[PDB]
Amino acid sequence: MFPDLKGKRVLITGSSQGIGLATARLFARAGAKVGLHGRKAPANIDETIASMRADGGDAAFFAADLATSEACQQLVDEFVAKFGGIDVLINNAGGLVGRKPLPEIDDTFYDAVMDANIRSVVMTTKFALPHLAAAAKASGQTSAVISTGSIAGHTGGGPGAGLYGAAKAFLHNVHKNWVDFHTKDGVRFNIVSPGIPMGRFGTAEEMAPAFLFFASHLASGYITGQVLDINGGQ
Amino acid sequence: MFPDLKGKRVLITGSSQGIGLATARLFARAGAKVGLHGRKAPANIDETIASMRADGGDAAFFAADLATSEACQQLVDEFVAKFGGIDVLINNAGGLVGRKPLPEIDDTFYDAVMDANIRSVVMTTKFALPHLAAAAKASGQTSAVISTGSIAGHTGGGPGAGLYGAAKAFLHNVHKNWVDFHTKDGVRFNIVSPGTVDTAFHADKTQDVRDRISNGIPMGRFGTAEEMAPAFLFFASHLASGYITGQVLDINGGQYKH
Amino acid sequence: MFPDLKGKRVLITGSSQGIGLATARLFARAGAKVGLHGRKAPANIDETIASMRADGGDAAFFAADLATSEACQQLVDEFVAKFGGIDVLINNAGGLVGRKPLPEIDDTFYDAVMDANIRSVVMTTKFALPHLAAAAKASGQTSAVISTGSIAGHTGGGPGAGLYGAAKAFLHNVHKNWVDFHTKDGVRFNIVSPGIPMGRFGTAEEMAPAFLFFASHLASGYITGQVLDINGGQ
Amino acid sequence: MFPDLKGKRVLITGSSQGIGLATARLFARAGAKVGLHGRKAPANIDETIASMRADGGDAAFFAADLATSEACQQLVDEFVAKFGGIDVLINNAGGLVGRKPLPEIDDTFYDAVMDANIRSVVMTTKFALPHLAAAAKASGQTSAVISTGSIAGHTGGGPGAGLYGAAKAFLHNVHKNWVDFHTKDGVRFNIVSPGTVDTAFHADKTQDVRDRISNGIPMGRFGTAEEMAPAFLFFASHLASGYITGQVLDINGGQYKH
């Protein structure tokens, strides 16, 4: 959607389905080289890659459970081995995991939610950072980190979702620290967050352009530390 | 920057210079029909209009002081008479008026700041609304209102700018009400909130002050007017942002306080 | 409710009824000298003053419509003529005025809401400031400004209440400027803001202690620029 | 500071020193029965307990590292065994652990910060909740949970403190969920969020750094632990704050960024 995305090396965690996949398809159309990721390879992964290549981009799939640091390191290393560097990281791995009210929150549930939603983002960003910085140094422009937030990161998680909302609030805040200390490395950090004034739920296609906007130096070069909610007024 | 902006009728208040102008230019490059506005025509207005038309857009200039409701209604009426409707309203008119500490804020100054920055936005949006709604009904998509906020609307105005910051905070909030009651009219309301931008707005600042500010911004400099523009087009494009409403997007290089 | 409120000179705008009056009664119990205010004197004003004096404080009533600057100046002057200075200003004048949707917002309604809710606060604070500063200089402690906000100043006004919510948001912000530029004058600026998790609406008595807390240097001497919502989780 | 605190059973995690201790002292002066807590007893613990008892309150010390759920459950159980129930929980345990830039954040450090600051609050609140609810049911009023946030939870952690700031932001948010689902249990949840306070927390800072910070704070200095305490009592008192829940109160002398 932006001319300066052509050839950009874009790693998108949690892109085997949903918003992540929709976003990956848009980047490929823009001519980007896209790292697809999930815990397991989709059965139709070859078709998806073929389509992304037909659309004028490139794609490769990487399997990993990003709940551990070693998996985050391996994903980054595999992606760089394939495409030679990183221009854009999209942290979209994560999710609800399950729903448990406070009296039912044990260690196993806590660890599941916190590792899936926070450790994944912190460690993947950590390992991607030197690559993102090197890319920005080489181009004289900016590299981009975009993490997926939630409306719950603003006003709290729903039933059984206390930890999920708070985990997303964590991400909103840690990005502020990353802005303060890594703007000097040429990396911009922004967040997209996929009763309702619009009277309907949003689609995956409606969440995707915002990711490309935040990824494009042309579009958003002076924009960092932002949280863009896509919620039809919710 | 987005293909669905071609032919869109875009009224941009405060677009003679600076952010408003840079934004107008980008819209015309996208093929939009742009209403340019200021209190009086700038010396370069013919050149500006020519460039916008060469780009495949269109442009017409409208003079108004939007401090009164009558001027807001007349601007909207004149714009509709020229272009036939409204798809996008950008409320960018406003300004400091001056810098006065609290002890020096008399009615003249208070009224000047409040009318320039708040009444202008409320009344211009009011008069544009039926047109924006009709356009959305006709297209089956959405029309857009985008208002210019400020970093000051989050963390407070600087020296003598207490009313200016608070006026911008007013705009940030009133948009929430408009989302709640006019989303059903097919209108999306969003805010672009510039930080410190290298425009006439900050031309009074000494080199020492500019340097001080620049050193405190993570990106190490003031923004440019051109760095503000893409966000407006993004919010104006149903293709790009059709499920986005009631957002405030800060363009500040990491800066959150004056 | 706090021992250091004894003898404090407390001007409370919009205190002839409701939250303002309830707050005034608490200050008088704490031994404060209280300026009561409304557009018109209540029919039972003499009884109210007598009660406040019986409770160990003092009270006087001042009539004014604070929609104009001259009325704000006159109120401050009358209060200082009566009590000799100002330690605490509570800006509680204001209100909805009426309910009009955007297409019905004309100049007369706009002016009504904006003057009642914003001009009143800006001008009363302006005229009270030199007195507040002199009081803080003399005691070596702090003087206090407390303005009444609303939940609407955070999440927007309800039906026909767009301007009211936004006016309260204005107050939230202008206080930040006043913190930046008048903390040096020994004045603290805070806000109290009187579907619902608690399953009930709040009372005037439940809104009052927060005002005394923010007014007491002992309780809140390092606290400024705050907004305390009293809404049962709303 | 409030008459209804007399006899209240108040568990304060991280109360050996600093803010937690100053808060504990003020509660005991109000006649409360206070649970003091740290990883190990401070040298002055007998003196502290003596002073609190002389004031007409009571105090007992409980050792725990609240990084594990087991330790949180044991603390709550031991407190209830001593005092018979819980009226107020103050979650003040936490800390930096260390300062590490993002490249240096390994699992050991991450786990240490996250467990110390988040798991501690989640698990201690979980185990205290049935007691807090029973106390509120019995009194016909409310019990209170107050957690210590931070300025950093709003605007981000400083050098090497990215996880600490974000952990505090986590606490600010999770309280919203607890309000939504446990208000019906008669428990109010509020946060006291200190700015820069003159405690052991900042003892590592050079004079140059302390001076720099102090000059940027509107009130011109770090806060004291004693300046934090009244807010906790305010939030703990049903008399004072019975209709107040889900609030975050910053005590920062006008400072909003590190």
PDB file of N, CA and C in Angstrom, chain A residues 69-70 102-107 110-111 114-115 118-119 122-123 125-126 129 152-159 161-163 165-167 169-170 173-174 176-178 180-182, chain D residues 69 102-103 105-107 110-111 114 118-119 122-123 125-126 129 152-159 161-163 165-167 169-170 173-174 176-178 180-182 257-258:
ATOM      1  N   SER A  69      12.283 -18.153  25.232  1.00  0.00           N
ATOM      2  CA  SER A  69      13.286 -17.276  24.624  1.00  0.00           C
ATOM      3  C   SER A  69      14.074 -17.973  23.514  1.00  0.00           C
ATOM      4  N   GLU A  70      14.443 -19.231  23.738  1.00  0.00           N
ATOM      5  CA  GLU A  70      15.212 -19.974  22.734  1.00  0.00           C
ATOM      6  C   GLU A  70      14.466 -20.097  21.399  1.00  0.00           C
ATOM      7  N   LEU A 102     -10.287 -14.736  38.868  1.00  0.00           N
ATOM      8  CA  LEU A 102      -9.139 -14.594  39.780  1.00  0.00           C
ATOM      9  C   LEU A 102      -8.947 -15.792  40.737  1.00  0.00           C
ATOM     10  N   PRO A 103     -10.024 -16.253  41.418  1.00  0.00           N
ATOM     11  CA  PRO A 103      -9.839 -17.394  42.330  1.00  0.00           C
ATOM     12  C   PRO A 103      -9.335 -18.672  41.650  1.00  0.00           C
ATOM     13  N   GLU A 104      -9.448 -18.739  40.325  1.00  0.00           N
ATOM     14  CA  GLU A 104      -9.016 -19.919  39.570  1.00  0.00           C
ATOM     15  C   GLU A 104      -7.678 -19.732  38.855  1.00  0.00           C
ATOM     16  N   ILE A 105      -7.043 -18.579  39.042  1.00  0.00           N
ATOM     17  CA  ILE A 105      -5.768 -18.322  38.373  1.00  0.00           C
ATOM     18  C   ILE A 105      -4.626 -19.008  39.125  1.00  0.00           C
ATOM     19  N   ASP A 106      -4.230 -20.183  38.644  1.00  0.00           N
ATOM     20  CA  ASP A 106      -3.074 -20.883  39.201  1.00  0.00           C
ATOM     21  C   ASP A 106      -1.820 -20.552  38.397  1.00  0.00           C
ATOM     22  N   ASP A 107      -0.682 -21.109  38.804  1.00  0.00           N
ATOM     23  CA  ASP A 107       0.594 -20.847  38.133  1.00  0.00           C
ATOM     24  C   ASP A 107       0.595 -21.284  36.672  1.00  0.00           C
ATOM     25  N   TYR A 110      -1.491 -18.695  34.668  1.00  0.00           N
ATOM     26  CA  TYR A 110      -0.691 -17.467  34.696  1.00  0.00           C
ATOM     27  C   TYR A 110       0.500 -17.566  33.741  1.00  0.00           C
ATOM     28  N   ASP A 111       1.314 -18.609  33.898  1.00  0.00           N
ATOM     29  CA  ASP A 111       2.497 -18.785  33.054  1.00  0.00           C
ATOM     30  C   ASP A 111       2.122 -18.853  31.578  1.00  0.00           C
ATOM     31  N   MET A 114       1.081 -15.286  30.374  1.00  0.00           N
ATOM     32  CA  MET A 114       2.181 -14.328  30.444  1.00  0.00           C
ATOM     33  C   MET A 114       3.287 -14.664  29.447  1.00  0.00           C
ATOM     34  N   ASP A 115       3.608 -15.950  29.310  1.00  0.00           N
ATOM     35  CA  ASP A 115       4.637 -16.360  28.352  1.00  0.00           C
ATOM     36  C   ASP A 115       4.187 -16.137  26.910  1.00  0.00           C
ATOM     37  N   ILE A 118       3.558 -11.886  26.647  1.00  0.00           N
ATOM     38  CA  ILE A 118       4.596 -10.934  27.031  1.00  0.00           C
ATOM     39  C   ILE A 118       6.003 -11.447  26.734  1.00  0.00           C
ATOM     40  N   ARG A 119       6.347 -12.646  27.212  1.00  0.00           N
ATOM     41  CA  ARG A 119       7.719 -13.122  26.995  1.00  0.00           C
ATOM     42  C   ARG A 119       8.018 -13.214  25.501  1.00  0.00           C
ATOM     43  N   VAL A 122       8.785  -9.567  24.259  1.00  0.00           N
ATOM     44  CA  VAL A 122      10.043  -9.045  24.795  1.00  0.00           C
ATOM     45  C   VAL A 122      11.250  -9.722  24.140  1.00  0.00           C
ATOM     46  N   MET A 123      11.222 -11.049  24.073  1.00  0.00           N
ATOM     47  CA  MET A 123      12.379 -11.792  23.571  1.00  0.00           C
ATOM     48  C   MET A 123      12.517 -11.706  22.045  1.00  0.00           C
ATOM     49  N   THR A 125      11.514  -9.233  20.135  1.00  0.00           N
ATOM     50  CA  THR A 125      12.004  -7.872  19.884  1.00  0.00           C
ATOM     51  C   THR A 125      13.490  -7.751  20.245  1.00  0.00           C
ATOM     52  N   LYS A 126      13.880  -8.320  21.386  1.00  0.00           N
ATOM     53  CA  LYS A 126      15.285  -8.316  21.797  1.00  0.00           C
ATOM     54  C   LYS A 126      16.188  -8.885  20.706  1.00  0.00           C
ATOM     55  N   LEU A 129      16.203  -6.819  17.389  1.00  0.00           N
ATOM     56  CA  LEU A 129      16.704  -5.438  17.509  1.00  0.00           C
ATOM     57  C   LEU A 129      18.018  -5.150  16.755  1.00  0.00           C
ATOM     58  N   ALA A 152      -8.628  -4.259  25.556  1.00  0.00           N
ATOM     59  CA  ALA A 152      -8.497  -4.731  26.941  1.00  0.00           C
ATOM     60  C   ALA A 152      -7.269  -4.158  27.662  1.00  0.00           C
ATOM     61  N   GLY A 153      -6.254  -3.758  26.894  1.00  0.00           N
ATOM     62  CA  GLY A 153      -5.059  -3.109  27.441  1.00  0.00           C
ATOM     63  C   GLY A 153      -5.311  -1.681  27.904  1.00  0.00           C
ATOM     64  N   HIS A 154      -6.477  -1.147  27.544  1.00  0.00           N
ATOM     65  CA  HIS A 154      -6.903   0.177  27.991  1.00  0.00           C
ATOM     66  C   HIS A 154      -7.889   0.103  29.156  1.00  0.00           C
ATOM     67  N   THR A 155      -8.967  -0.661  28.981  1.00  0.00           N
ATOM     68  CA  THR A 155     -10.090  -0.623  29.929  1.00  0.00           C
ATOM     69  C   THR A 155     -10.272  -1.920  30.735  1.00  0.00           C
ATOM     70  N   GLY A 156      -9.333  -2.854  30.588  1.00  0.00           N
ATOM     71  CA  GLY A 156      -9.353  -4.109  31.346  1.00  0.00           C
ATOM     72  C   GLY A 156      -9.912  -5.276  30.555  1.00  0.00           C
ATOM     73  N   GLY A 157      -9.466  -6.485  30.895  1.00  0.00           N
ATOM     74  CA  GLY A 157      -9.950  -7.700  30.244  1.00  0.00           C
ATOM     75  C   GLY A 157     -11.355  -8.068  30.682  1.00  0.00           C
ATOM     76  N   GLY A 158     -12.082  -8.762  29.809  1.00  0.00           N
ATOM     77  CA  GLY A 158     -13.436  -9.227  30.119  1.00  0.00           C
ATOM     78  C   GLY A 158     -13.441 -10.410  31.079  1.00  0.00           C
ATOM     79  N   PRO A 159     -14.550 -11.180  31.103  1.00  0.00           N
ATOM     80  CA  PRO A 159     -14.668 -12.332  32.007  1.00  0.00           C
ATOM     81  C   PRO A 159     -13.551 -13.359  31.807  1.00  0.00           C
ATOM     82  N   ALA A 161     -10.523 -12.901  31.673  1.00  0.00           N
ATOM     83  CA  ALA A 161      -9.494 -12.352  30.789  1.00  0.00           C
ATOM     84  C   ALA A 161      -8.640 -11.255  31.440  1.00  0.00           C
ATOM     85  N   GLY A 162      -8.628 -11.222  32.774  1.00  0.00           N
ATOM     86  CA  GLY A 162      -7.865 -10.223  33.529  1.00  0.00           C
ATOM     87  C   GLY A 162      -6.403 -10.136  33.123  1.00  0.00           C
ATOM     88  N   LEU A 163      -5.759 -11.290  32.996  1.00  0.00           N
ATOM     89  CA  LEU A 163      -4.332 -11.336  32.686  1.00  0.00           C
ATOM     90  C   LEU A 163      -4.053 -10.937  31.243  1.00  0.00           C
ATOM     91  N   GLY A 165      -5.811  -8.740  29.243  1.00  0.00           N
ATOM     92  CA  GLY A 165      -5.887  -7.284  29.146  1.00  0.00           C
ATOM     93  C   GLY A 165      -4.668  -6.612  29.758  1.00  0.00           C
ATOM     94  N   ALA A 166      -4.254  -7.099  30.927  1.00  0.00           N
ATOM     95  CA  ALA A 166      -3.116  -6.513  31.635  1.00  0.00           C
ATOM     96  C   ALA A 166      -1.802  -6.784  30.904  1.00  0.00           C
ATOM     97  N   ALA A 167      -1.696  -7.961  30.287  1.00  0.00           N
ATOM     98  CA  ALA A 167      -0.528  -8.293  29.467  1.00  0.00           C
ATOM     99  C   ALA A 167      -0.405  -7.326  28.291  1.00  0.00           C
ATOM    100  N   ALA A 169      -1.660  -4.227  28.252  1.00  0.00           N
ATOM    101  CA  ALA A 169      -1.260  -2.971  28.891  1.00  0.00           C
ATOM    102  C   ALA A 169       0.250  -2.931  29.137  1.00  0.00           C
ATOM    103  N   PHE A 170       0.807  -4.067  29.564  1.00  0.00           N
ATOM    104  CA  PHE A 170       2.258  -4.225  29.702  1.00  0.00           C
ATOM    105  C   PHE A 170       2.977  -3.844  28.400  1.00  0.00           C
ATOM    106  N   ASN A 173       3.101  -0.154  27.559  1.00  0.00           N
ATOM    107  CA  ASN A 173       4.069   0.536  28.385  1.00  0.00           C
ATOM    108  C   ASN A 173       5.511   0.220  27.997  1.00  0.00           C
ATOM    109  N   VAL A 174       5.825  -1.053  27.771  1.00  0.00           N
ATOM    110  CA  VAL A 174       7.223  -1.408  27.482  1.00  0.00           C
ATOM    111  C   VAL A 174       7.687  -0.721  26.191  1.00  0.00           C
ATOM    112  N   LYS A 176       7.066   2.229  25.368  1.00  0.00           N
ATOM    113  CA  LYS A 176       7.484   3.584  25.747  1.00  0.00           C
ATOM    114  C   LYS A 176       8.955   3.616  26.164  1.00  0.00           C
ATOM    115  N   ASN A 177       9.373   2.594  26.908  1.00  0.00           N
ATOM    116  CA  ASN A 177      10.769   2.430  27.285  1.00  0.00           C
ATOM    117  C   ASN A 177      11.622   2.192  26.048  1.00  0.00           C
ATOM    118  N   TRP A 178      11.110   1.378  25.128  1.00  0.00           N
ATOM    119  CA  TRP A 178      11.847   1.090  23.897  1.00  0.00           C
ATOM    120  C   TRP A 178      11.989   2.319  23.004  1.00  0.00           C
ATOM    121  N   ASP A 180      12.183   5.387  24.243  1.00  0.00           N
ATOM    122  CA  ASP A 180      13.162   6.242  24.917  1.00  0.00           C
ATOM    123  C   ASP A 180      14.592   5.784  24.669  1.00  0.00           C
ATOM    124  N   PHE A 181      14.802   4.471  24.592  1.00  0.00           N
ATOM    125  CA  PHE A 181      16.182   3.963  24.563  1.00  0.00           C
ATOM    126  C   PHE A 181      16.642   3.383  23.221  1.00  0.00           C
ATOM    127  N   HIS A 182      15.722   3.213  22.271  1.00  0.00           N
ATOM    128  CA  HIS A 182      16.117   2.647  20.973  1.00  0.00           C
ATOM    129  C   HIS A 182      15.678   3.473  19.755  1.00  0.00           C
TER     130      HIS A 182
ATOM    131  N   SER D  69       3.737 -18.501  44.275  1.00  0.00           N
ATOM    132  CA  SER D  69       2.353 -18.559  44.743  1.00  0.00           C
ATOM    133  C   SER D  69       2.246 -19.173  46.137  1.00  0.00           C
ATOM    134  N   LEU D 102      17.521  -3.750  27.093  1.00  0.00           N
ATOM    135  CA  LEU D 102      16.836  -4.843  26.392  1.00  0.00           C
ATOM    136  C   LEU D 102      17.779  -5.976  25.916  1.00  0.00           C
ATOM    137  N   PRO D 103      18.927  -5.637  25.285  1.00  0.00           N
ATOM    138  CA  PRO D 103      19.854  -6.695  24.845  1.00  0.00           C
ATOM    139  C   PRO D 103      20.323  -7.641  25.955  1.00  0.00           C
ATOM    140  N   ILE D 105      18.404  -8.537  28.722  1.00  0.00           N
ATOM    141  CA  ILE D 105      17.284  -9.148  29.437  1.00  0.00           C
ATOM    142  C   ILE D 105      17.178 -10.636  29.084  1.00  0.00           C
ATOM    143  N   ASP D 106      17.743 -11.477  29.948  1.00  0.00           N
ATOM    144  CA  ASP D 106      17.638 -12.927  29.791  1.00  0.00           C
ATOM    145  C   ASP D 106      16.476 -13.461  30.633  1.00  0.00           C
ATOM    146  N   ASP D 107      16.232 -14.767  30.573  1.00  0.00           N
ATOM    147  CA  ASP D 107      15.095 -15.347  31.292  1.00  0.00           C
ATOM    148  C   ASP D 107      15.212 -15.158  32.805  1.00  0.00           C
ATOM    149  N   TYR D 110      14.286 -11.461  33.524  1.00  0.00           N
ATOM    150  CA  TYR D 110      12.864 -11.323  33.199  1.00  0.00           C
ATOM    151  C   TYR D 110      11.983 -11.983  34.264  1.00  0.00           C
ATOM    152  N   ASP D 111      12.256 -13.251  34.565  1.00  0.00           N
ATOM    153  CA  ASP D 111      11.470 -13.981  35.564  1.00  0.00           C
ATOM    154  C   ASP D 111      11.532 -13.314  36.933  1.00  0.00           C
ATOM    155  N   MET D 114       9.383 -10.054  36.769  1.00  0.00           N
ATOM    156  CA  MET D 114       7.963 -10.346  36.576  1.00  0.00           C
ATOM    157  C   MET D 114       7.344 -11.033  37.800  1.00  0.00           C
ATOM    158  N   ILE D 118       4.684  -8.741  39.552  1.00  0.00           N
ATOM    159  CA  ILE D 118       3.358  -9.105  39.052  1.00  0.00           C
ATOM    160  C   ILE D 118       2.782 -10.353  39.737  1.00  0.00           C
ATOM    161  N   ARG D 119       3.492 -11.480  39.679  1.00  0.00           N
ATOM    162  CA  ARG D 119       2.949 -12.723  40.249  1.00  0.00           C
ATOM    163  C   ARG D 119       2.625 -12.541  41.736  1.00  0.00           C
ATOM    164  N   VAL D 122      -0.788 -10.588  41.931  1.00  0.00           N
ATOM    165  CA  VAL D 122      -1.878 -11.442  41.479  1.00  0.00           C
ATOM    166  C   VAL D 122      -2.189 -12.525  42.519  1.00  0.00           C
ATOM    167  N   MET D 123      -1.156 -13.228  42.971  1.00  0.00           N
ATOM    168  CA  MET D 123      -1.367 -14.373  43.862  1.00  0.00           C
ATOM    169  C   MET D 123      -1.735 -13.944  45.284  1.00  0.00           C
ATOM    170  N   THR D 125      -3.284 -11.196  46.147  1.00  0.00           N
ATOM    171  CA  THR D 125      -4.668 -10.714  46.076  1.00  0.00           C
ATOM    172  C   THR D 125      -5.650 -11.878  45.975  1.00  0.00           C
ATOM    173  N   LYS D 126      -5.332 -12.862  45.130  1.00  0.00           N
ATOM    174  CA  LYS D 126      -6.151 -14.065  45.006  1.00  0.00           C
ATOM    175  C   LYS D 126      -6.405 -14.726  46.363  1.00  0.00           C
ATOM    176  N   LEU D 129      -8.435 -12.496  48.866  1.00  0.00           N
ATOM    177  CA  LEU D 129      -9.792 -12.139  48.424  1.00  0.00           C
ATOM    178  C   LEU D 129     -10.946 -12.747  49.246  1.00  0.00           C
ATOM    179  N   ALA D 152       6.260   5.274  36.485  1.00  0.00           N
ATOM    180  CA  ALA D 152       6.816   4.472  35.391  1.00  0.00           C
ATOM    181  C   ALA D 152       5.744   3.630  34.714  1.00  0.00           C
ATOM    182  N   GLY D 153       4.693   3.299  35.463  1.00  0.00           N
ATOM    183  CA  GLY D 153       3.545   2.583  34.904  1.00  0.00           C
ATOM    184  C   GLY D 153       2.690   3.412  33.955  1.00  0.00           C
ATOM    185  N   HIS D 154       2.916   4.726  33.939  1.00  0.00           N
ATOM    186  CA  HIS D 154       2.241   5.627  33.010  1.00  0.00           C
ATOM    187  C   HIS D 154       3.117   5.969  31.811  1.00  0.00           C
ATOM    188  N   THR D 155       4.361   6.364  32.068  1.00  0.00           N
ATOM    189  CA  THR D 155       5.187   6.950  31.008  1.00  0.00           C
ATOM    190  C   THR D 155       6.423   6.118  30.644  1.00  0.00           C
ATOM    191  N   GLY D 156       6.589   4.976  31.309  1.00  0.00           N
ATOM    192  CA  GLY D 156       7.677   4.051  30.989  1.00  0.00           C
ATOM    193  C   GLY D 156       8.793   4.054  32.018  1.00  0.00           C
ATOM    194  N   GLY D 157       9.437   2.900  32.170  1.00  0.00           N
ATOM    195  CA  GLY D 157      10.600   2.769  33.039  1.00  0.00           C
ATOM    196  C   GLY D 157      11.811   3.518  32.510  1.00  0.00           C
ATOM    197  N   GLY D 158      12.697   3.906  33.423  1.00  0.00           N
ATOM    198  CA  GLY D 158      13.951   4.553  33.048  1.00  0.00           C
ATOM    199  C   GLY D 158      14.997   3.555  32.576  1.00  0.00           C
ATOM    200  N   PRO D 159      16.281   3.960  32.612  1.00  0.00           N
ATOM    201  CA  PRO D 159      17.409   3.141  32.158  1.00  0.00           C
ATOM    202  C   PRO D 159      17.414   1.746  32.791  1.00  0.00           C
ATOM    203  N   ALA D 161      15.093  -0.272  33.219  1.00  0.00           N
ATOM    204  CA  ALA D 161      13.899  -0.524  34.028  1.00  0.00           C
ATOM    205  C   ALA D 161      12.636  -0.731  33.180  1.00  0.00           C
ATOM    206  N   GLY D 162      12.822  -1.147  31.926  1.00  0.00           N
ATOM    207  CA  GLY D 162      11.698  -1.370  31.007  1.00  0.00           C
ATOM    208  C   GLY D 162      10.657  -2.334  31.547  1.00  0.00           C
ATOM    209  N   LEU D 163      11.121  -3.436  32.131  1.00  0.00           N
ATOM    210  CA  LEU D 163      10.209  -4.442  32.686  1.00  0.00           C
ATOM    211  C   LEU D 163       9.516  -3.952  33.950  1.00  0.00           C
ATOM    212  N   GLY D 165       8.700  -0.720  34.788  1.00  0.00           N
ATOM    213  CA  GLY D 165       7.634   0.198  34.392  1.00  0.00           C
ATOM    214  C   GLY D 165       6.433  -0.537  33.835  1.00  0.00           C
ATOM    215  N   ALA D 166       6.696  -1.501  32.959  1.00  0.00           N
ATOM    216  CA  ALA D 166       5.619  -2.240  32.308  1.00  0.00           C
ATOM    217  C   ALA D 166       4.873  -3.148  33.292  1.00  0.00           C
ATOM    218  N   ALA D 167       5.589  -3.692  34.279  1.00  0.00           N
ATOM    219  CA  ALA D 167       4.959  -4.466  35.354  1.00  0.00           C
ATOM    220  C   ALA D 167       3.985  -3.597  36.144  1.00  0.00           C
ATOM    221  N   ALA D 169       2.496  -0.908  34.934  1.00  0.00           N
ATOM    222  CA  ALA D 169       1.379  -0.696  34.005  1.00  0.00           C
ATOM    223  C   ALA D 169       0.410  -1.882  34.018  1.00  0.00           C
ATOM    224  N   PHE D 170       0.967  -3.087  34.129  1.00  0.00           N
ATOM    225  CA  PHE D 170       0.176  -4.308  34.269  1.00  0.00           C
ATOM    226  C   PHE D 170      -0.750  -4.220  35.487  1.00  0.00           C
ATOM    227  N   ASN D 173      -3.695  -1.856  35.121  1.00  0.00           N
ATOM    228  CA  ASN D 173      -4.749  -2.425  34.288  1.00  0.00           C
ATOM    229  C   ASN D 173      -5.513  -3.559  34.962  1.00  0.00           C
ATOM    230  N   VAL D 174      -4.795  -4.495  35.576  1.00  0.00           N
ATOM    231  CA  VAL D 174      -5.444  -5.691  36.130  1.00  0.00           C
ATOM    232  C   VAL D 174      -6.461  -5.303  37.218  1.00  0.00           C
ATOM    233  N   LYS D 176      -8.543  -2.939  37.020  1.00  0.00           N
ATOM    234  CA  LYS D 176      -9.801  -2.671  36.313  1.00  0.00           C
ATOM    235  C   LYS D 176     -10.652  -3.930  36.208  1.00  0.00           C
ATOM    236  N   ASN D 177     -10.005  -5.044  35.878  1.00  0.00           N
ATOM    237  CA  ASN D 177     -10.680  -6.329  35.832  1.00  0.00           C
ATOM    238  C   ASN D 177     -11.213  -6.733  37.202  1.00  0.00           C
ATOM    239  N   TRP D 178     -10.418  -6.497  38.245  1.00  0.00           N
ATOM    240  CA  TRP D 178     -10.831  -6.881  39.592  1.00  0.00           C
ATOM    241  C   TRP D 178     -12.021  -6.042  40.078  1.00  0.00           C
ATOM    242  N   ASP D 180     -14.286  -4.845  37.992  1.00  0.00           N
ATOM    243  CA  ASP D 180     -15.428  -5.317  37.211  1.00  0.00           C
ATOM    244  C   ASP D 180     -16.069  -6.573  37.812  1.00  0.00           C
ATOM    245  N   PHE D 181     -15.255  -7.467  38.366  1.00  0.00           N
ATOM    246  CA  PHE D 181     -15.777  -8.770  38.785  1.00  0.00           C
ATOM    247  C   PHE D 181     -15.811  -9.028  40.298  1.00  0.00           C
ATOM    248  N   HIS D 182     -15.191  -8.151  41.086  1.00  0.00           N
ATOM    249  CA  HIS D 182     -15.151  -8.365  42.539  1.00  0.00           C
ATOM    250  C   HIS D 182     -15.696  -7.196  43.374  1.00  0.00           C
ATOM    251  N   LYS D 257       7.353  12.154  34.043  1.00  0.00           N
ATOM    252  CA  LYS D 257       8.321  11.284  33.358  1.00  0.00           C
ATOM    253  C   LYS D 257       9.651  11.156  34.113  1.00  0.00           C
ATOM    254  N   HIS D 258      10.303   9.997  33.976  1.00  0.00           N
ATOM    255  CA  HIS D 258      11.594   9.731  34.628  1.00  0.00           C
ATOM    256  C   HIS D 258      12.675  10.740  34.222  1.00  0.00           C
TER     257      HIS D 258
END
